[PDB]
C-alpha cells in the first residue's frame, strides 16, 4: 500500500560516476551543486515570505507557526552569515512571543518553542536581558503541565529538546543538568509504571502512550522517546540503559514489517505511512542511536533496511515537508551517511534534493500550512540549506 502514497523514484541508485556531479571524494558538495541549492533557497524564500503574509496571526509554534520560521532564519544565518536573516528571525520571534497560550510545554507545539528560540536569537544579537528573561520563563514553564505525555509534540521529551536547544546554542550550561535529570527520571518512572500495569514488562520494560494509542514512531511514539533516552545529553545510567531502554528498543525492532517499515501504533496492521511522524523515516533515528550506544549489528542492519524503504517509497504525494514529506525523508539518508560515512546515502539525499528543486511540479497536495517549518516550505528550505554542509546536517527540532 506504500506504493499508493509515493511517486515512483525516477533516479538511478548510487555509483561513483553519478555521484561526481554532486560531491567530491571527501563528500564535500561541488561548487555547482552548492550554487543550485543556494539559488533554489533564494527563490523559495521569496515565495515563503509572501505566503506567510496570509498565515494565521495566532499560531506562534515551531511546528506550524512563527517560531518555526525563526528557527529557519537562525539556521540560514548560521549557514550563510547574512545579517538580514538574523533580522528576519527577530521579526518572527517577536510575533511568536505575542502568541503564547500557556497550553503546552514543547518546542514544537507549545510555549517552549517561542521562548527557547527567542533566548538564542537574543543571545546572537547580544541582547543579554531579553535572552536571560526568556530562559527564566522557559525554566518556569515546567510547572504548567505535570502529567503531560512523554512524546515529542506534546510531551516531556519535547520540553527537554527546548532546554537542550538553549544549552547547545549558548555553548554553556544555561539550563542546569539537574533540571533535565528530573524530567528524565519522570519519563523512566512513567514508562516502567505503564509497562507494569499492562504486563508488557517481560517483552518491554518500558511503555508509553498518547491519546490512548501505543504510538511507535518519532513524533508521538516509542522511537522518539527511546532515541532521547539513549542520548548522552539525558545522562541515563548504564544500568537503566541496559536493563530498561535496550530491551524496550528491541521490542520496537520486532514490530518491523516484512517490508522494513514500521506500524504507526502497536497492533496497527497498515504498512502505509513512510513519514518522519509515522514509519521508517522517524524510527531510523532510534536504530542509529541504538547502534552508536550498544554497537549491535542488528540495529545497523535495520537502519539500512529503513533507508531502502525510503529510497523506494519516500517521494511522497503528501509533499516536500519535514513531518511527512520528501525533505523529512531525505534526512533519514543524511543520518545514516553521518553514521557510516557511506557516500551512497549522501547521494540518496542529493537526489531527494533534486526532487525538491522541482518544487510544485509533481502534483503534490498543498499542505494545510503551506509555508510552515514542519508541514510546508520553510522545512524544505531548511533541508536544502542544511545539505550544503552534510556532516553538520540535523533534522530540526528533533535530532541531536
Ligand atoms: N496537516 C497535514 C495533513 C495531515 C497529515 O498528513 N498527518 C500525518 C500525521 S502528522 C499523517 O500521517 N496522517 C495520516 C495519513 O497520512 O494517513 C498537512 O497539511 O501536511
Ligand atoms: Zn506528520
Author numbering: 0 to 399
Question: What text does the study give?
Answer:
The addition of the thiol side chain of Cys residues to dehydroalanine and dehydrobutyrine is a process that occurs in all domains of life and is catalyzed by LanC enzymes. The addition of GSH (C-glutathionylation) removes electrophilic Dha/Dhb residues from the proteome.
We therefore determined the structure of LanCL1-C264A in complex with GSH (1.79 Å resolution), showing that the structure is near-identical to that of the wild-type enzyme.
